[PDB]
Design a binder for this molecule. Structure first.
Ligand SMILES: O=C(NO)c1ccc(Cn2cc(CCO)c3ccccc32)cc1
Ligand SMILES: [K+]
Ligand SMILES: [K+]
Ligand SMILES: [Zn+2]
Length: 631
């Protein structure tokens, strides 16, 4: 029922700055804040967001995560002169203090709680807080690495206290390790902390052994801390996506968080002087998009680092875009994660195995600019059986031109000599694909259909000439859809009930063994289907479901995540009217929140799945989550 996206920001937080020479802190400037809001303003995004005001955090809230004696000593800094401010800062590592910083720290904190409250009160669906100073390095009795108070720690503690939450997921995709967040929730199994970070075998700041993958939490919270150390600079989109598909997402969907909070720092992005990675801003559209099916979309993005005043704004804009539901940009050039990343991913997956199901089976600069993401006027066209009419969210619509109608005549004579109300299915399929591929008006659609074969063929062939350079086809059924995969412009994902050994590397054919069937599907969706689809980079996704064929629990999740491919251009062909299935498909297509899920897959199922990884990862390297054996 919740709508919109909150943007919490206030120019006051840029009214503190470093007052002495120190090359460690020079990079953390007020302009980081004004650049990112200005970038949100320029692209129409901030205007499209519910502005929620900033508040100060109360002392009672600050004591949730900080010690009175630390709070007392910081409380004294607004009265310090500059010589005194330098001395107080030297008691800490990589942090400076300013007469206004205690003020803005309470604002950065309070802005986060505001965001937590807005999201949790259903007043918005998600949101983002542009704040200074950052939080994730801050610890219970010290400032650290530009942080005074742990803004994201507050949010989770505060949502625990005030909304009685049991399961919070913090995703820290900053390039630095959020050690303050690890410390704070180390023994807490209700807060699941994932952080990737530049490590370089402990030689990169903050130089902590606890920053390594060996740290999994302590006491009753072991398994709820997940460190992914990058041991080389220059990580790429393919590395980041591998991290999500083979570590974070599999754990995150199993955890089923009741709320997701992001330490969104963008020093993890190409051009950042500190992070020195190579991921494009566009990756952050997908980072965000891949987590939105969690917690019914209740996601609180919070700003940490990011220091290239140009790499910064672009990644902010990509995050808010996806928060607002705008189409994700296609990521091209994806492939294998580099070997150092495969090493880290391999190790972290292995030490975590004793605690998670998806892994349990292994224990036996100058860049280009990010285009523009025009939101679609009518996001989702719907085409129910003739006569039947349904209730559609405001961004949906129903059904034919003469030009369209002759082409059906054309196709009839050439390919289907024996021809009713199917030449309506065919007629709409064309106009929806025409509306999708031609105009950026309709974005995706769904069409209920009678004959499978005539309709899928006409759909796929009309798409290949649209032009769609490549079509990803995902079919839930047991037949053999007339989809030739010789040319390599078509990849096919078949989810059937009968084992059917695939021969070649442009089909992926899974046969699951019934209670198991949901948790089996999700591991395969995150482990196999999403990595291949993302490497393939289709221009259009073709969804198909057979009348005959427990895939009412997962279709929403798959319909949501598969829209990260193909600018969100999916066309779903449902055989047979099913009020709940159509309503669910249209809901996911149109952008609604996906309701959460909740039994670990059968061992025969994990076994079949990595048969398919083995058979396919030489071609589709984003499938890999171990270092390659070298002959
Ligand atoms: O963004 C952050 N955390 O989220 C963050 C960023 C940097 C620092 C401390 N530091 C400062 C520099 C100056 C070079 O330009 C430097 C260089 C190498 C390693 C460490 C370095 C703390 C936190
Ligand atoms: K991080
Ligand atoms: K924890
Ligand atoms: Zn950082």
């Amino acid at each position: 029922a919740a709508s919109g996206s909150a943007l919490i920001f206030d120019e006051e937080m840029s009214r503190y700055k470093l007052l002495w020479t120190d090359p460690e802190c020079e990079i953390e400037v007020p302009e980081r804040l004004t650049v990112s809001y200005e970038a949100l303003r320029t692209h129409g995004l901030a205007q499209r967001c519910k502005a929620v005001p900033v508040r100060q955090a109360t002392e009672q809230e600050i004591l949730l995560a900080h010690s009175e004696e630390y709070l007392e000593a910081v409380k004294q800094t607004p009265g310090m002169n500059v010589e005194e401010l330098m001395a107080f800062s030297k008691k800490y590592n990589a942090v400076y203090f300013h007469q206004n910083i205690y003020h803005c720290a309470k604002l950065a904190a309070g802005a986060t709680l505001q965001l937590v409250d807005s999201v949790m009160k259903r007043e918005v669906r998600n949101g983002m807080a542009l704040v200074r100073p950052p939080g994730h390095h801050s610890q219970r009795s010290a400032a650290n690495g530009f942080c005074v108070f742990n803004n994201v720690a507050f949010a989770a503690l505060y949502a625990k206290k005030n909304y009685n939450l049991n399961r919070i997921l913090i995703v820290d995709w900053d390039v630095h390790h959020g050690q303050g967040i690890q410390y704070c929730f180390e023994e807490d199994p209700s807060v699941l902390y994932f952080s990737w970070h530049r490590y370089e075998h402990q030689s990169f700041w903050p130089n902590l052994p606890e920053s390594d993958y060996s740290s999994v939490g302590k006491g009753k919270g072991s398994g709820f801390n997940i460190n992914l150390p990058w041991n080389k600079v220059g990580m790429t989109n393919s590395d980041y996506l591998a991290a999500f598909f083979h570590v974070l997402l599999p754990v995150a969907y199993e955890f089923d968080p009741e709320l997701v909070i992001v330490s969104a720092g963008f020093d993890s992005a190409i051009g950042d002087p500190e992070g020195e990675m190579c991921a494009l801003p566009e990756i952050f559209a997908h980072l965000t998009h891949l987590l939105m099916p969690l917690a019914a979309g209740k996601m609180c993005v919070v700003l940490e680092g990011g220091y290239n005043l140009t790499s910064l704004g672009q990644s902010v804009c990509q995050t808010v875009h996806s928060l607002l539901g705008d189409p994700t940009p296609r990521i091209s050039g994806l492939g294998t994660a580099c070997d150092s990343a495969l090493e880290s991913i391999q190790n972290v997956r292995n030490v975590q195995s004793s605690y998670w199901s998806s892994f349990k089976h292994l224990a036996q600069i100058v860049w280009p600019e990010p285009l523009k993401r025009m939101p679609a006027s009518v996001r989702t066209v719907v085409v129910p059986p003739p006569g039947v009419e349904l209730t559609l969210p405001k961004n949906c619509q129903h059904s034919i031109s003469e030009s369209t109608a002759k082409e059906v005549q054309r196709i009839r004579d050439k390919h289907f000599h024996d021809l009713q109300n199917i030449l309506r299915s065919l007629g709409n399929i064309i106009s929806v694909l025409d509306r999708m591929m031609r105009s950026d008006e309709v974005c995706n659609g769904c069409v209920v259909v009678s004959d499978l074969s005539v309709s899928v063929q006409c759909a796929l062939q009309h798409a290949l000439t649209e032009p769609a350079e490549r079509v990803l086809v995902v079919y839930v059924g047991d037949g053999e859809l007339p989809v030739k995969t010789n040319d390599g412009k078509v990849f096919l994902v078949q989810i059937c009930t009968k084992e059917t050994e695939d021969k070649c590397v442009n089909r992926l054919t899974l046969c699951l063994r019934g209670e198991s069937l949901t948790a089996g599907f999700m591991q395969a969706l995150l482990g196999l289907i999403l990595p291949v689809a993302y490497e393939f980079n289709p221009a259009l996704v073709l969804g198909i479901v057979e009348e005959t064929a427990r895939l009412m629990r997962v279709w929403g999740h798959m319909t949501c995540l598969i829209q990260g491919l193909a600018r969100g251009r999916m066309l779903t062909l449902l055989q047979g009217y099913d009020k709940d299935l159509l309503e669910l498909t249209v809901s996911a297509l149109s952008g609604a929140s996906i309701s959460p899920l909740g039994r670990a897959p059968k061992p025969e199922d994990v076994e079949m799945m990595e048969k398919q990884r083995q058979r396919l990862q030489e071609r589709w390297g984003l499938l890999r989550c171990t270092v390659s054996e070298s002959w």
